[PDB]
């Protein structure tokens, strides 16, 4: 009960920007998620025990692959704490206990490859799940993991809010699939635009939340730049992974994912960013106007990825 998680100082202020890397001594990752719950929901939300375990097996369920594995579960997570506590009073208990463990759980047993990869090898997840092929496996993962002895880190609910928690749960994980990102944007803008945005229309809450989840997916983009740069090493090295996987079927992967096209990354970065990252922080700081330093951010990286083509870098 009085057993508060505290971090050194340099860790205790900036973990409250949008900005803060998580650092490379895995060992602190746990009591850096723990602290962004007690801070975010409470030190009452959860069981401290149950919470513990519930992390190490989420941990453990996190594959050894450079980029969707355990450092970006906790990164993420920290994105949504910073989200949620830049917007204190806008979302409720349950949704403020469900979006951490979201985003913790978003990619659990991951193994490095697009859903494309998947339904172009005829994996067997692609015939269990025909759409948002890793987010619906992403999802299965987390109720196990919740259904282990000592790990129902919410047995404390009643019937109807363990239901409402778990079906944020899902529909926070759903939308990580940036296949349906582009339609919930374009939906949320029209709703923004002609006024009709209601935050107590639950339809739209979910919206919300699922450009949220975008957000804080996509968040490498909204680092300072060493670390973006780093980052997007990470990326490609599971993507030309792929690419190598597509050429073993006998088909050309898209230039995304073909290591030969290692040039054409700085360009890549423009569209990725036009495309994707400005749009979705856009969007987001006119919904939640605290959330702007992701747009700043994301807009520095950009200018970055200029000066690269440019030769200045
Ligand atoms: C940065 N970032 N963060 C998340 C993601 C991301 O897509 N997701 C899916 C799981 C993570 C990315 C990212 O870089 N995405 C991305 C998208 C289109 C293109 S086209 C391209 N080039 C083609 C031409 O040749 C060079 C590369 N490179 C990219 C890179
Ligand atoms: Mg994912
Ligand atoms: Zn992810």
Redesign the pocket.
Known sequence: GLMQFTLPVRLCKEIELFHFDIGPFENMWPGIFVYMVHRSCGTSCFELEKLCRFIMSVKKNYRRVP??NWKHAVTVAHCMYAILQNNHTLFTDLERKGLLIACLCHDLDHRGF?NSYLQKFDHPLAALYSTSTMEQHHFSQTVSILQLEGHNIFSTLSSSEYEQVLEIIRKAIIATD?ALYFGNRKQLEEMYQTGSLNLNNQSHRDRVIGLMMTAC??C??TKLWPV?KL??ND??A??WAEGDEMKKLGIQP???M?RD?????????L???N???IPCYTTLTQILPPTEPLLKACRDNLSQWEKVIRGEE
């Open positions: 980029y969707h697009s940036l997916d996509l490498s983009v973006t980052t997007a990326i490609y599971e993507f898209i230039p995304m073909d096209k290692k040039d054409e990354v700085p360009q890549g970065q569209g990725f960013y495309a994707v990252a």
